[PDB]
Structure formats: structure tokens, C-alpha cells
Amino acid sequence: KSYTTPKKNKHKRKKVKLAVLKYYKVDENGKISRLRRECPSDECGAGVFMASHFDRHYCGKCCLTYCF
Amino acid sequence: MLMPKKNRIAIYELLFKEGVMVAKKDVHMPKHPELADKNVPNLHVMKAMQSLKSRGYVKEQFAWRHFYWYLTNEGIQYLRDYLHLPPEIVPATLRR
Amino acid sequence: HRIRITLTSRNVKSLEKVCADLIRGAKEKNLKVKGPVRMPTKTLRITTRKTPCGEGSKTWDRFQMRIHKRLIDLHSPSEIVKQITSISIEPGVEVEVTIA
Amino acid sequence: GHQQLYWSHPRKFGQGSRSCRVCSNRHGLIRKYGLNMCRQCFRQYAKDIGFIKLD
Amino acid sequence: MAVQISKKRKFVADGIFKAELNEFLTRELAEDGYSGVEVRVTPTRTEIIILATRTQNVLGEKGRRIRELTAVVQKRFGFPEGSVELYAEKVATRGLCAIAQAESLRYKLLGGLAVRRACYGVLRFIMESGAKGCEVVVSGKLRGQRAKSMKFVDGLMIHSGDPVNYYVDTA
RNA sequence: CGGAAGGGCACCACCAGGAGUGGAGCCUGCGGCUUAAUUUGACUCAACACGGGAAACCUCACCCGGCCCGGACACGGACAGGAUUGACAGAUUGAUAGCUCUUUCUCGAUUCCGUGGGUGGUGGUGCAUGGCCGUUCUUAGUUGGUGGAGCGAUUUGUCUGGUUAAUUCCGAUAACGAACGAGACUCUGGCAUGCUAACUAGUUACGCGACCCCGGUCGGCGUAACUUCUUAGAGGGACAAGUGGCGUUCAGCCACCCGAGAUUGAGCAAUAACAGGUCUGUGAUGCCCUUAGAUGUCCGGGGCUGCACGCGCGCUACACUGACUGGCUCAGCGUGUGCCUACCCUACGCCGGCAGGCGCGGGUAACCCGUUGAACCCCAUUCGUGAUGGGGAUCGGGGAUUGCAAUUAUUCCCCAUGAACGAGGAAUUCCCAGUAAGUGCGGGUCAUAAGCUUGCGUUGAUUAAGUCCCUGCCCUUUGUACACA
């Protein structure tokens, strides 16, 4: 049957080209600079970066929040 | 059915160490009653065995609450090619 | 040394044959044996509808399951009791052996 | 979450937590002596269980 | 037992065990000629004779389906390793078995033999095997949409009383 | 089929009565009305406390909104420069659903987008069905083989007469040999002082201990025998056996001595049929419909209870043959700790009037509840014919139990308010012996729960041993212009 209220669309996945390129900062010597904070959790030691939002930092799958 | 790779390998390893496998008709189960070591939910077990059944690799039976699967030789060869195991070791249902 | 045998069964004459065989075995092995004591029977009563739906005259079933239980005491060691109870068993009678 | 609301219902009681062990329906359950099955399948399989109409 | 179940629940659970086991082997050994089971419980072991017609067809490839059925019972009923044993045995004088002739007749009708010829063949086979009487009632839709029920009865056949419980066989 | 004749049978029929319904209140179901929904099947016996249907969730099939794919598998694209899940913050939302909107972290080939296709459906179809149940039909009817009558459908056997609950037999007979049903069968109940047995039951005698004046009581303890009381096994006992009458002196009927019964009740129950109910019992199933904004499934709430009305099954009363208060005294069917299952029956001691709460115990059951100390009934005061101390509808305040959640009072208890109802019209239901009826106790529905149903126990009658008068059924004959009769 015909409807009046429009349906709610699916959340379109915003794809990110080369998401690892936005993590580190490269130098001409043999060193790297880490922009985003690593998560200090036990299940994710050092290989997992955290989200760099505009006001506070957050790690998703362990749900760890750092506010200012 | 997006499944964990660890649970998929565990259910296929149980299906390879014994070809016939049972399951309980209940979607709302946290853990499988036979393999209580891993997570392995019963809905994942039923849908993985239904995916094996729909392409004709296993035999289906039912007794009032429980789905029974009899693994055939084509399923033996498919699990061997999937797990990359040598053909010398055999499942326990052909043991004598 | 006072070892207790509980005989639970659904059928009547098969249980009678089993307990008579136990009596004859105890009499041939010549030990102090008490009489077989009859516990009172139990009639499991189920009253349901004959009709799958509820359309028609109100009829009711009487499903009756009659279970029976006897006990036999023996003044003998455990090897004699296991030797008697390991011979001539049939599916109609369940045997429970209590040491104390 | 979906995992937090897919099984948020307490099934510790009621006639919908229990069901038949043949049909898995929620009507006419014989919970007596641990049968846990409907009366139609009980009438169907009473000869296999052992219940007989004596009187 | 550590949980200490009652005997009232125990005999009922044994009856449900026999009913579910009978239905499972009826649905699973239908094409091979299933006719019954007989179970024996001993200390630490549980023997069971499957009573069927085609023993080679119920064993398969050197007891493979028998080992599959032992694994079915072991996985579903929680039995320990090697605590249950199955043995297939051939039905003597299978023409008197009512459910074997019933499964033969439904597989004939599934293969595509006609109803009248199939009932004549079943009745002739059981009267050659030697029986007191028969009652072959095939109910369903025949030669159209209206339900037409047939009935092929000859010989002595009792219907009422206590002898109908264990003097005839109904399938 | 006959408001045609001749017989027999039936308290789902009558006579004679007994208890009732229809009169009042309440509960449940149905129709109708209203509503987003008041989900739906069934409409005479054979629908209407029926679907085990005593629904806050679930059941739920209905409505209002929101998740998810649990769309397998195959084909064509996308992709490791990443196919696609999960994610607390702030707005939204109902929820601490990333369900969405702005910002980004994470999952790792399981997945996504289209085309075929499958699964699921308490969706429709019981006029497609299978199975089950009910009914025709609790009555005694039904069918081959051979032979006979008739061209044939058909008839005899399958009955003139007697008898029986019965096509049950006697006996004539174009019939003979037979078959299903009935009968026969199984179980339940009293008869056993005889057998088998008993420390999961008792009896008799003692050893004591307590009390009263040698004797009496003690479920207070233990033991030398036993099963009489308790239980369950083999049995036996009743068969018209005997006598007196009626009757072809056959089939059978009545009374009576002896005797526990000289007709206990239930189950099964023939051929053939129902356009009976069930697709809402099934992963029993055919056809049609939906299948991603779902008729799949889950969550939150409501509803299935709604109220100017009528009908059906039940409960309470209309009272002195009764109400209230104390004292006394008697059972058996039974049930009891769960695969998931998260939920058992309770002894005893304290807190409280109460519902109940707290602790250790017992019990997987003749061990513990429990000698199952249940009601009517028995005895003694209060009442005095007043809608009164009958009755408890309605309604307010409060306290606890079960559950995540009681509001539309889940249930239980305390106080208070105190309606109709003065034995009920036409009409109608059930029944004749431990029967009706009064009365209470168990199981199912159950977490909380019986105004229902099925079993069991106590007290326990009036009236009848007949009939086709009414309502129907079964044989014979007759008539038919009916054969969805």
C-alpha cells in the first residue's frame, strides 16, 4: 500500500582512501611521528590508535573516553 | 551471516573431527552445548551448516528439537581442501 | 554386608519372574535372605482431551501408567550380590543396588 | 545496541518461556512429570512412552 | 546420581527417550526398512538392537551409518564415550510386520505404482507370507479433487476389546 | 418419509418424585455496539467454564512506532590504494536501538549492490487433504462364498412364533458354511482369620518410664513371634449353581435357602457416510499471497476484561432444619527439588492480629509434610421473623506475597460502607442405590491462581422396577409423483 511518512535511509558508509596515511608523519630521516594517541588498554597495547575528535578522545571497541 | 573466523574454524574443525554433528533448534543460545569452550552460538552453527547443506555437501535429519547432519565424502574433500590438511588422517566416524 | 536391592518395573509378571529368580539364586547360594517386600504401586494418571481442537462433545482420556517397586535385603558381601545381579537381566526391571 | 535489545526479555517464567518438545508451540503443554509436550503429540506418542488406557 | 532424579520422572523420561528414538529412526531409516528398536540398560553400558529388514542398507559401508547413529545418540543424549552400542538385526517373517508393509506401500506409491495394483500386490504378498487377515485403508485424493477412500479387507480381523491391543498390529 | 398399522427399546423421553435453570447478585463464554485493536474458529442435539483459552510480559495471530536478516546457494560488478560489521559522547529517540544527523576510530574477505532462487508465515483455503475427534448409532445392526427366485437392478440365508440389554438362543425353514459387532476381553470394588512376604506399615506379649486410685492410658522408647488391621502376587470364589412355580418343557423368566456379591463401573467397540471441527499442534502437506518500508523475527505500550442490551454453563443466598462463637471428632485419589528451566512439598522456633519474614532440619518419596488432626455433622451460649447477627454486590483507607512491570484494584489479610434477593412465569436439565443432592480434599491451567474441569472422601435419601402418552431409535407390512431423500 501507499505510504505518507517517508522511510529512514541507510547510513551511507563514508569510505576513506588510505586511512593509514593520516596516522603518521614522515621525516626524511629514519623516524616516525605519532599524531593520534595510542590506547593504553590491555586488549590493545600499542597497535591501535584512538579517534582524534574536536573536543575529546575516544577508543571504540574498548569504549575508553578521555575528556579535557 | 558475518561470522568470526575463530568460531568458523572451530565449527569446521568439530565437523572434521566428527562428520555427523547435532544442533538444537534455538536461535537464542549463547553457547553451543557440546563445545562449551569457545563462544560458538547456535544460530551461527545452524546457519553455517545450512550454508553447507544448500550447496549439497551434507545430509539433513530432524527429531523434534534437533537438526542432525551426516557429512558425505564430498564434504570430507571440501573440508580437507579448506583446512589444507593431509589426506592420511581420517574422521572418527570411519574408524575401525 | 546388609545389601539392598530395589526392583522397579512397569510390567507385572516380568517383575515377578525377576524377583523369583533372585529368590532362587539366593536360596541356591545359601545366604540369610529376607522376604521380598512390596511397596505400594503407583498409577500415573493423565486426563487430556480426545479431540485435538475443542469442537465436539467433551470427552476425556484416562492414561494410566502402573509402576511397581519391590525390595530384597541380603546378608552377604558385595561380590555375591554383583554375581547374582549380573546374570539374567531384562529391560522391564530396573535394579538399584545399595551397599549400606 | 542490537545485541542489548535482541534478548532483553526475562524468560524466567510464564507459558511462553516453556514450550512443547515436538511442536514447540505454547498451547496445551503437559508439564506434568517432565513431559513438557502438547496434548496432541502426547496422544500420538502415548503408546511409545508407555501410557495405556486401562480404565 | 548426583542430581538424584526421581523414579516418577525417570520412567517418564525413559518413555520420552524411547518415543524420540523411535521417531528418529523411523524418519532416518525409512528408505531402508525400519521396524523397531529394543533397548537394554546395564551398569556402565547400554545395548540396543535395531530391528530392521535390509541389514546391508542400514549398515552401509562397513558399519559407517551405524557409527554415525552411535555418534548421534552420544552427542544428543549426553552419553559417555563407548557407553552405548547399537546392533542391527534382520526381521524374521517381515510380512506380518504392519509398519514394514506400510513403508513398502508408501515407497511404492512414491515410486509411482498405481493404488489398486499396489494394494493388490501388498495384500498378495502378506497372504503369501501367511496372516490371519488384513485391512488396507488408503485415504486421500484419488482421480480428482474429491477425497476417495479405499478399503481392501479379507480374512479374520478383530476390532474391539482388549485383544486389539496386542493381537493385531496397526500402522 | 407418513399427524399409516403391528411389536420392542431409551430418565441425552414420560409417569411418580428428588435437586435445579429461567427470578436477584457475581464469574466465564457468545451475539450486538463503540473503538487504532476490542485477533479468531464454532451457531440445535453434535457451538456458547469449548480450542485444555483462569491472556499485565510471552502466548498474540490485532493496532500504534522503531531494530535486524536469521534473503541459503548460483550468476554479473566492487575491493586489499580495503568487500563490509561494531562504536561512548552532543540533537533525535522510549531504551545506555551508531535507528538516524556533524566528527572520526575499529572488524578483516565471513561480507555488499542487482538478477534467478530458497527459507519463514497462529496469512487465506477443513469445499484439496492426511491424521485425530464428534455424530449418524448405546442402539443392534453389517458383509462375503456356494446354492435357489427373478431378463435385470435385487431377494433368500439376514425369520412365522417364544425369549434376551443384544441378528442372544430354541424351533420351523431354499438354504448351508461362515465373518465383524454384541457377547467374549482388560482394569477397577467389596469374599479370603488359607499361601508368599515385610525395620520405608502395624498387631500381641514383655523390659522400662510418667500419671490416677491390683487395675487403666500413653503415635514415649526398644525387642520374641505374626500378618488380623497395611500393601501387592499366584490364586480361588458365581455359574441361573439348588429348590418351588410359568413357559413347545427347548430357548428362557420370577421368588427363595445357603451365601460378600444371584444385573458395579470404565476402556475397546462392526459396514458405510457426514462437503461436521482442526491449515491457530507439527520442520504432516498441496494451491494462492507476502518476502526487506515483510503477513519472517524482536523490542515498548495498549487490547483480547471495554457496555443502554439478550442468551448459555456455573458459584452465593433468599434463612430458626439457620447465622455467629468455643469444645469434640473422622479419608483417599493424589502431588512434591525440573536438559533448556532460571520455578518443589514443608516439620519446628522466634517477630506480628493478619497476609507473611527470618534460621537451621527432612524428603527424588509407604522414610518428610502426615496417624494426612478437611468440611457437613455432634454438644453448650448469643439471636427472635426485622431484608435481622441471612446474604455479601458495590466502594474508601491500609498492610504483605509472586513478578522486570499491577494502572483497568494480579492474589491474600484488617476495618468500614451494606444493594437486589421473601422459593422465581412460559419453558427446560439430570437421575433411580452408596445413586441424586449437601460437603470438603488432590492433579491440569500455576512465578503469583479454581467462581472451570478431572479424580477422591464424608453424610446420604424420596419415588419407580412400567410405558409409547411427548421426544427419538430399531425389525415387519403398506403408500410415494422424494432420492442435495
Short mmCIF file of N, CA, C and O in Angstrom, two decimals, chain E residues 11-117:
data_model
loop_
_atom_site.label_atom_id
_atom_site.label_comp_id
_atom_site.label_asym_id
_atom_site.label_seq_id
_atom_site.Cartn_x
_atom_site.Cartn_y
_atom_site.Cartn_z
N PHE E 11 11.06 -42.91 34.75
CA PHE E 11 10.35 -43.78 33.80
C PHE E 11 9.66 -42.97 32.71
O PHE E 11 9.59 -43.42 31.55
N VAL E 12 9.17 -41.77 33.03
CA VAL E 12 8.59 -40.90 32.01
C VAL E 12 9.67 -40.42 31.04
O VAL E 12 9.45 -40.38 29.82
N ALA E 13 10.86 -40.08 31.55
CA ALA E 13 11.97 -39.69 30.69
C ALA E 13 12.46 -40.86 29.84
O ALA E 13 12.87 -40.65 28.70
N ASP E 14 12.40 -42.09 30.37
CA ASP E 14 12.72 -43.26 29.56
C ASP E 14 11.68 -43.48 28.46
O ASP E 14 12.03 -43.89 27.34
N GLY E 15 10.41 -43.20 28.75
CA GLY E 15 9.39 -43.30 27.73
C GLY E 15 9.54 -42.25 26.64
O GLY E 15 9.36 -42.54 25.45
N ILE E 16 9.90 -41.02 27.02
CA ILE E 16 10.19 -39.97 26.04
C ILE E 16 11.44 -40.31 25.24
O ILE E 16 11.51 -40.03 24.04
N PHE E 17 12.43 -40.94 25.89
CA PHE E 17 13.63 -41.43 25.21
C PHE E 17 13.27 -42.45 24.14
O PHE E 17 13.73 -42.35 22.99
N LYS E 18 12.43 -43.43 24.49
CA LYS E 18 12.00 -44.44 23.53
C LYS E 18 11.17 -43.84 22.40
O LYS E 18 11.32 -44.23 21.24
N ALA E 19 10.32 -42.85 22.72
CA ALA E 19 9.47 -42.23 21.70
C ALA E 19 10.29 -41.41 20.71
O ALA E 19 10.11 -41.52 19.49
N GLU E 20 11.20 -40.57 21.23
CA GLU E 20 12.05 -39.75 20.36
C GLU E 20 13.02 -40.61 19.56
O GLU E 20 13.28 -40.31 18.39
N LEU E 21 13.52 -41.69 20.16
CA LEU E 21 14.42 -42.60 19.46
C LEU E 21 13.69 -43.35 18.35
O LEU E 21 14.22 -43.51 17.24
N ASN E 22 12.46 -43.79 18.63
CA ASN E 22 11.63 -44.46 17.64
C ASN E 22 11.29 -43.53 16.49
O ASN E 22 11.36 -43.93 15.32
N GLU E 23 10.97 -42.27 16.79
CA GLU E 23 10.63 -41.32 15.73
C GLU E 23 11.86 -40.95 14.90
O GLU E 23 11.77 -40.81 13.67
N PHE E 24 13.02 -40.81 15.55
CA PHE E 24 14.25 -40.50 14.83
C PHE E 24 14.66 -41.63 13.89
O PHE E 24 14.99 -41.39 12.72
N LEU E 25 14.63 -42.88 14.37
CA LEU E 25 14.97 -43.98 13.48
C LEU E 25 13.88 -44.27 12.46
O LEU E 25 14.18 -44.84 11.40
N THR E 26 12.63 -43.87 12.73
CA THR E 26 11.59 -44.00 11.72
C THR E 26 11.79 -43.00 10.59
O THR E 26 11.66 -43.35 9.41
N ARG E 27 12.14 -41.75 10.93
CA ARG E 27 12.40 -40.75 9.89
C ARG E 27 13.72 -41.00 9.18
O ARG E 27 13.87 -40.61 8.02
N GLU E 28 14.69 -41.63 9.84
CA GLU E 28 16.02 -41.76 9.25
C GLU E 28 16.19 -43.07 8.48
O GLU E 28 16.83 -43.08 7.43
N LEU E 29 15.64 -44.18 8.98
CA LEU E 29 15.74 -45.47 8.31
C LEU E 29 14.46 -45.83 7.55
O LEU E 29 14.09 -47.00 7.48
N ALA E 30 13.78 -44.83 6.98
CA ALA E 30 12.52 -45.09 6.29
C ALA E 30 12.75 -45.80 4.97
O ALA E 30 12.02 -46.74 4.63
N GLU E 31 13.76 -45.38 4.22
CA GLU E 31 14.07 -45.97 2.92
C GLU E 31 14.81 -47.30 3.02
O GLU E 31 15.04 -47.94 1.99
N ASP E 32 15.18 -47.73 4.23
CA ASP E 32 15.95 -48.95 4.41
C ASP E 32 15.17 -50.06 5.11
O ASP E 32 15.69 -51.16 5.27
N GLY E 33 13.93 -49.79 5.53
CA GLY E 33 13.10 -50.83 6.12
C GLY E 33 13.17 -50.93 7.63
O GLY E 33 13.44 -52.00 8.18
N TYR E 34 12.93 -49.81 8.32
CA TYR E 34 12.92 -49.81 9.77
C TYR E 34 11.67 -50.49 10.32
O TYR E 34 10.58 -50.35 9.76
N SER E 35 11.84 -51.24 11.41
CA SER E 35 10.72 -51.93 12.05
C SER E 35 10.66 -51.79 13.56
O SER E 35 9.57 -51.97 14.12
N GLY E 36 11.75 -51.49 14.24
CA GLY E 36 11.66 -51.24 15.67
C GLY E 36 13.02 -51.17 16.33
O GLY E 36 14.06 -51.32 15.70
N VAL E 37 12.98 -50.91 17.64
CA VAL E 37 14.17 -50.93 18.49
C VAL E 37 13.87 -51.70 19.76
O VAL E 37 12.71 -51.88 20.16
N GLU E 38 14.93 -52.17 20.41
CA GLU E 38 14.84 -52.77 21.73
C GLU E 38 16.08 -52.40 22.52
O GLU E 38 17.20 -52.72 22.09
N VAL E 39 15.90 -51.76 23.67
CA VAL E 39 16.99 -51.18 24.44
C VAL E 39 17.18 -51.98 25.72
O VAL E 39 16.22 -52.51 26.29
N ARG E 40 18.44 -52.13 26.14
CA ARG E 40 18.83 -52.79 27.38
C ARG E 40 19.82 -51.90 28.10
O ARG E 40 20.81 -51.45 27.49
N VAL E 41 19.58 -51.63 29.38
CA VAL E 41 20.48 -50.83 30.19
C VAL E 41 21.15 -51.75 31.22
O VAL E 41 20.48 -52.52 31.92
N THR E 42 22.47 -51.73 31.24
CA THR E 42 23.31 -52.44 32.19
C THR E 42 24.11 -51.40 32.98
O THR E 42 24.06 -50.21 32.66
N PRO E 43 24.82 -51.80 34.04
CA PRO E 43 25.82 -50.89 34.61
C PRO E 43 26.92 -50.59 33.60
O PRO E 43 27.51 -51.51 33.01
N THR E 44 27.11 -49.29 33.32
CA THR E 44 28.16 -48.63 32.53
C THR E 44 27.96 -48.85 31.02
O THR E 44 28.61 -48.20 30.20
N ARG E 45 27.01 -49.70 30.62
CA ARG E 45 26.77 -49.94 29.20
C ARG E 45 25.28 -49.90 28.88
O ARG E 45 24.43 -50.16 29.73
N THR E 46 24.98 -49.57 27.62
CA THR E 46 23.61 -49.53 27.12
C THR E 46 23.60 -50.16 25.73
O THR E 46 24.10 -49.56 24.77
N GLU E 47 23.04 -51.36 25.62
CA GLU E 47 22.95 -52.06 24.35
C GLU E 47 21.60 -51.77 23.72
O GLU E 47 20.61 -51.55 24.42
N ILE E 48 21.56 -51.72 22.38
CA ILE E 48 20.28 -51.58 21.70
C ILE E 48 20.29 -52.30 20.35
O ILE E 48 21.18 -52.09 19.51
N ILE E 49 19.30 -53.17 20.16
CA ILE E 49 19.09 -53.87 18.89
C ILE E 49 18.12 -53.05 18.06
O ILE E 49 16.95 -52.87 18.43
N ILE E 50 18.61 -52.53 16.94
CA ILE E 50 17.74 -52.06 15.86
C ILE E 50 17.22 -53.29 15.14
O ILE E 50 18.00 -54.18 14.77
N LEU E 51 15.91 -53.38 14.99
CA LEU E 51 15.27 -54.48 14.28
C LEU E 51 14.77 -53.92 12.95
O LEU E 51 13.80 -53.16 12.92
N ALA E 52 15.46 -54.27 11.86
CA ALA E 52 15.16 -53.75 10.54
C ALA E 52 15.20 -54.89 9.53
O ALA E 52 15.56 -56.02 9.86
N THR E 53 14.82 -54.58 8.29
CA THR E 53 14.75 -55.60 7.24
C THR E 53 16.03 -55.69 6.43
O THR E 53 16.65 -56.75 6.36
N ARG E 54 16.45 -54.58 5.82
CA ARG E 54 17.62 -54.57 4.95
C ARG E 54 18.85 -54.19 5.77
O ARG E 54 19.18 -53.01 5.94
N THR E 55 19.53 -55.22 6.30
CA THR E 55 20.65 -55.00 7.20
C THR E 55 21.86 -54.42 6.48
O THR E 55 22.58 -53.59 7.05
N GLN E 56 22.09 -54.82 5.22
CA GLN E 56 23.18 -54.24 4.44
C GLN E 56 22.93 -52.76 4.16
O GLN E 56 23.86 -51.95 4.19
N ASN E 57 21.67 -52.39 3.94
CA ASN E 57 21.33 -50.99 3.70
C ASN E 57 21.33 -50.16 4.97
O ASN E 57 21.55 -48.95 4.91
N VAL E 58 21.08 -50.77 6.14
CA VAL E 58 21.21 -49.97 7.36
C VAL E 58 22.64 -49.94 7.88
O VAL E 58 22.97 -49.07 8.69
N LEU E 59 23.52 -50.85 7.43
CA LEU E 59 24.91 -50.72 7.83
C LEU E 59 25.70 -49.82 6.88
O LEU E 59 26.55 -49.05 7.32
N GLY E 60 25.43 -49.91 5.58
CA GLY E 60 26.10 -49.05 4.62
C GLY E 60 27.46 -49.55 4.18
O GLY E 60 27.57 -50.65 3.62
N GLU E 61 28.50 -48.77 4.42
CA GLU E 61 29.86 -49.10 4.03
C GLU E 61 30.64 -49.47 5.29
O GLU E 61 31.29 -48.61 5.90
N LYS E 62 30.54 -50.75 5.68
CA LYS E 62 31.23 -51.35 6.82
C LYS E 62 30.87 -50.63 8.13
O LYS E 62 31.72 -50.07 8.83
N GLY E 63 29.58 -50.64 8.43
CA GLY E 63 29.08 -50.06 9.67
C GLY E 63 29.21 -48.56 9.79
O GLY E 63 29.22 -48.04 10.91
N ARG E 64 29.30 -47.84 8.66
CA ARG E 64 29.53 -46.40 8.70
C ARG E 64 28.31 -45.66 9.25
O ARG E 64 28.43 -44.81 10.13
N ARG E 65 27.12 -46.00 8.75
CA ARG E 65 25.90 -45.36 9.24
C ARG E 65 25.57 -45.82 10.66
O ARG E 65 24.96 -45.06 11.42
N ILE E 66 26.00 -47.02 11.04
CA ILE E 66 25.84 -47.47 12.42
C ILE E 66 26.70 -46.64 13.36
O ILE E 66 26.25 -46.22 14.43
N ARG E 67 27.96 -46.38 12.97
CA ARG E 67 28.82 -45.50 13.76
C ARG E 67 28.28 -44.07 13.80
O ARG E 67 28.40 -43.39 14.83
N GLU E 68 27.68 -43.62 12.70
CA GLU E 68 27.03 -42.31 12.68
C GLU E 68 25.86 -42.25 13.66
O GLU E 68 25.67 -41.25 14.35
N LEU E 69 25.07 -43.33 13.75
CA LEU E 69 23.94 -43.35 14.68
C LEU E 69 24.41 -43.43 16.13
O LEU E 69 23.79 -42.83 17.02
N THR E 70 25.51 -44.15 16.39
CA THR E 70 26.09 -44.15 17.74
C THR E 70 26.59 -42.76 18.12
O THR E 70 26.41 -42.33 19.26
N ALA E 71 27.18 -42.04 17.16
CA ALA E 71 27.61 -40.67 17.44
C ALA E 71 26.42 -39.73 17.61
O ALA E 71 26.51 -38.78 18.39
N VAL E 72 25.31 -39.99 16.91
CA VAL E 72 24.07 -39.23 17.11
C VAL E 72 23.57 -39.38 18.54
O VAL E 72 23.26 -38.40 19.22
N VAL E 73 23.48 -40.63 19.01
CA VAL E 73 22.99 -40.90 20.36
C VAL E 73 23.95 -40.33 21.41
O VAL E 73 23.52 -39.71 22.40
N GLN E 74 25.26 -40.44 21.16
CA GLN E 74 26.27 -39.93 22.08
C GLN E 74 26.25 -38.41 22.17
O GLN E 74 26.41 -37.84 23.26
N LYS E 75 26.04 -37.72 21.04
CA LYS E 75 26.03 -36.26 21.08
C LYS E 75 24.71 -35.71 21.60
O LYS E 75 24.70 -34.69 22.29
N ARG E 76 23.58 -36.35 21.28
CA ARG E 76 22.30 -35.76 21.63
C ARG E 76 21.88 -36.12 23.06
O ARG E 76 21.32 -35.28 23.76
N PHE E 77 22.15 -37.35 23.50
CA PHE E 77 21.67 -37.79 24.80
C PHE E 77 22.73 -37.71 25.89
O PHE E 77 22.50 -38.20 27.00
N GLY E 78 23.88 -37.09 25.61
CA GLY E 78 24.89 -36.87 26.62
C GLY E 78 25.59 -38.10 27.13
O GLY E 78 26.13 -38.08 28.24
N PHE E 79 25.60 -39.19 26.36
CA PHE E 79 26.21 -40.43 26.81
C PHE E 79 27.73 -40.35 26.71
O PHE E 79 28.27 -39.66 25.85
N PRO E 80 28.45 -41.05 27.61
CA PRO E 80 29.92 -41.06 27.53
C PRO E 80 30.47 -41.83 26.33
O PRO E 80 29.71 -42.42 25.56
N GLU E 81 31.79 -41.81 26.17
CA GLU E 81 32.43 -42.47 25.04
C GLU E 81 32.39 -43.98 25.21
O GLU E 81 32.94 -44.52 26.17
N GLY E 82 31.74 -44.66 24.27
CA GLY E 82 31.64 -46.10 24.31
C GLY E 82 30.65 -46.64 25.31
O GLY E 82 30.69 -47.84 25.62
N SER E 83 29.76 -45.81 25.84
CA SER E 83 28.77 -46.25 26.81
C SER E 83 27.49 -46.77 26.16
O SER E 83 26.65 -47.34 26.86
N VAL E 84 27.33 -46.59 24.85
CA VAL E 84 26.17 -47.09 24.13
C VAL E 84 26.67 -47.89 22.93
O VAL E 84 27.72 -47.60 22.35
N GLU E 85 25.93 -48.95 22.59
CA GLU E 85 26.29 -49.81 21.47
C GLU E 85 25.03 -50.21 20.72
O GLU E 85 24.00 -50.53 21.34
N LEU E 86 25.09 -50.13 19.39
CA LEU E 86 23.97 -50.44 18.51
C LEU E 86 24.27 -51.70 17.70
O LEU E 86 25.40 -51.94 17.29
N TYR E 87 23.23 -52.50 17.48
CA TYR E 87 23.36 -53.74 16.71
C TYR E 87 22.14 -53.92 15.83
O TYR E 87 21.01 -53.94 16.33
N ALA E 88 22.35 -54.08 14.53
CA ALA E 88 21.26 -54.23 13.57
C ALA E 88 20.96 -55.70 13.35
O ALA E 88 21.87 -56.51 13.14
N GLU E 89 19.67 -56.05 13.38
CA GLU E 89 19.22 -57.43 13.24
C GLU E 89 18.06 -57.51 12.26
O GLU E 89 17.18 -56.63 12.24
N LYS E 90 18.04 -58.58 11.47
CA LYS E 90 17.05 -58.77 10.42
C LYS E 90 15.72 -59.24 10.99
O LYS E 90 15.68 -60.09 11.88
N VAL E 91 14.64 -58.66 10.48
CA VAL E 91 13.29 -59.05 10.89
C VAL E 91 12.97 -60.43 10.32
O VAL E 91 12.99 -60.63 9.10
N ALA E 92 12.68 -61.38 11.20
CA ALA E 92 12.14 -62.65 10.76
C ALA E 92 10.66 -62.48 10.43
O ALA E 92 9.94 -61.75 11.13
N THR E 93 10.21 -63.19 9.38
CA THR E 93 8.88 -63.17 8.75
C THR E 93 8.27 -61.77 8.66
O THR E 93 7.22 -61.48 9.23
N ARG E 94 8.93 -60.89 7.88
CA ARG E 94 8.61 -59.47 7.80
C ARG E 94 7.25 -59.18 7.16
O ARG E 94 6.82 -58.02 7.19
N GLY E 95 6.58 -60.17 6.57
CA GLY E 95 5.26 -59.95 6.01
C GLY E 95 4.19 -59.68 7.04
O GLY E 95 3.16 -59.08 6.71
N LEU E 96 4.40 -60.10 8.29
CA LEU E 96 3.46 -59.83 9.36
C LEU E 96 3.67 -58.48 10.02
O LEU E 96 2.80 -58.03 10.77
N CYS E 97 4.80 -57.82 9.76
CA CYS E 97 5.06 -56.50 10.32
C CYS E 97 4.21 -55.46 9.60
O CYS E 97 4.29 -55.34 8.37
N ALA E 98 3.40 -54.72 10.36
CA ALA E 98 2.45 -53.80 9.74
C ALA E 98 3.13 -52.53 9.25
O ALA E 98 2.77 -52.01 8.19
N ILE E 99 4.11 -52.01 9.99
CA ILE E 99 4.77 -50.78 9.57
C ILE E 99 5.75 -51.02 8.43
O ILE E 99 6.04 -50.09 7.67
N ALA E 100 6.26 -52.25 8.28
CA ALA E 100 7.14 -52.55 7.16
C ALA E 100 6.36 -52.62 5.85
O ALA E 100 6.82 -52.12 4.82
N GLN E 101 5.18 -53.23 5.88
CA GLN E 101 4.32 -53.23 4.71
C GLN E 101 3.78 -51.84 4.41
O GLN E 101 3.59 -51.48 3.24
N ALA E 102 3.58 -51.02 5.45
CA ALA E 102 3.15 -49.64 5.25
C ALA E 102 4.24 -48.80 4.60
O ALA E 102 3.95 -48.02 3.68
N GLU E 103 5.49 -48.96 5.04
CA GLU E 103 6.57 -48.19 4.42
C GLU E 103 6.86 -48.70 3.01
O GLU E 103 7.17 -47.90 2.12
N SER E 104 6.70 -50.01 2.78
CA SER E 104 6.80 -50.55 1.43
C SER E 104 5.72 -49.99 0.51
O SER E 104 6.00 -49.63 -0.63
N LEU E 105 4.49 -49.86 1.03
CA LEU E 105 3.39 -49.35 0.21
C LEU E 105 3.55 -47.87 -0.09
O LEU E 105 3.27 -47.42 -1.21
N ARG E 106 4.02 -47.08 0.88
CA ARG E 106 4.20 -45.65 0.60
C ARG E 106 5.40 -45.40 -0.31
O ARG E 106 5.36 -44.48 -1.13
N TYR E 107 6.46 -46.23 -0.22
CA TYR E 107 7.52 -46.09 -1.21
C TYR E 107 7.13 -46.61 -2.59
O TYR E 107 7.64 -46.08 -3.59
N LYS E 108 6.21 -47.57 -2.69
CA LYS E 108 5.67 -47.94 -4.00
C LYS E 108 4.84 -46.81 -4.60
O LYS E 108 4.98 -46.51 -5.79
N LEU E 109 3.99 -46.18 -3.79
CA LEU E 109 3.20 -45.06 -4.27
C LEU E 109 4.06 -43.83 -4.56
O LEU E 109 3.69 -43.00 -5.39
N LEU E 110 5.21 -43.71 -3.89
CA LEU E 110 6.14 -42.63 -4.18
C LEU E 110 6.92 -42.90 -5.46
O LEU E 110 7.22 -41.97 -6.22
N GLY E 111 7.27 -44.17 -5.72
CA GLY E 111 7.89 -44.52 -6.98
C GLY E 111 6.95 -44.38 -8.16
O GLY E 111 7.40 -44.08 -9.27
N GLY E 112 5.66 -44.59 -7.94
CA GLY E 112 4.69 -44.28 -8.97
C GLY E 112 3.78 -45.42 -9.37
O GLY E 112 3.10 -45.34 -10.40
N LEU E 113 3.77 -46.48 -8.57
CA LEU E 113 2.85 -47.58 -8.82
C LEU E 113 1.43 -47.16 -8.49
O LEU E 113 1.19 -46.34 -7.60
N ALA E 114 0.47 -47.70 -9.24
CA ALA E 114 -0.93 -47.35 -9.06
C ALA E 114 -1.46 -47.88 -7.73
O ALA E 114 -0.91 -48.81 -7.14
N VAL E 115 -2.56 -47.26 -7.27
CA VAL E 115 -3.07 -47.54 -5.93
C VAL E 115 -3.69 -48.93 -5.86
O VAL E 115 -3.41 -49.69 -4.92
N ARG E 116 -4.51 -49.29 -6.85
CA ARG E 116 -5.18 -50.59 -6.86
C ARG E 116 -4.18 -51.72 -7.03
O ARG E 116 -4.23 -52.73 -6.31
N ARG E 117 -3.24 -51.57 -7.97
CA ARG E 117 -2.22 -52.59 -8.20
C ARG E 117 -1.27 -52.71 -7.01
O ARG E 117 -0.86 -53.82 -6.65
#
